[PDB]
Amino acid sequence: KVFGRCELAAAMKRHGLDNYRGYSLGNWVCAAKFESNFNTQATNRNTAGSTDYGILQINSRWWCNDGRTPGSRNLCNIPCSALLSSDITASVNCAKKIVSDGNGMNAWVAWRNRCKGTDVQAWIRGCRL
């Protein structure tokens, strides 16, 4: 599924990401935009052989099982495929764990480089939330 901006904002808010660990909603929408272009089926391969999955590009090195990242963890206890669903529940619940794990949203490289410090509230302009 390719989400619309406000559509994704509403879903993320429904699922409790707004202000989660202190990160306002626009931070999450900005992160998603640059991680996946709001596309739930986004995938990308990392140099070490791990893969990143879904709207928030969650890394099989740590968070999910894809059976093809040996030595990795599965800290969200889910198949990485569940992170490609039209339904964002699994991605959001896993992102909650990731952002809690010490580095906050710096876990998302596109967020640190493209959203952090910027006017992220603009990403929710016009949305009915």
Ligand SMILES: CC(=O)N[C@@H]1[C@@H](O)[C@H](O[C@@H]2O[C@H](CO)[C@@H](O[C@@H]3O[C@H](CO)[C@@H](O[C@@H]4O[C@H](CO)[C@@H](O)[C@H](O)[C@H]4NC(C)=O)[C@H](O)[C@H]3NC(C)=O)[C@H](O)[C@H]2NC(C)=O)[C@@H](CO)O[C@H]1O
């Ligand atoms: C090639 C490329 O850059 N692709 C991107 C992916 O890398 C990226 O996924 C992110 O990947 C990084 C590095 O593997 C990952 O960061 C690591 O996360 C672990 C787990 O949270 C950290 O370990 C924790 O450290 C804290 C603080 O030190 C400890 O308190 C805590 O106990 C540790 N937890 C565990 C379980 O051991 C690592 O320190 C940390 N590594 C670095 C260098 O930051 C992110 O979690 C991955 N992010 C996501 C969303 O999965 C993906 C998104 O950034 O983007 C690709 O481009």
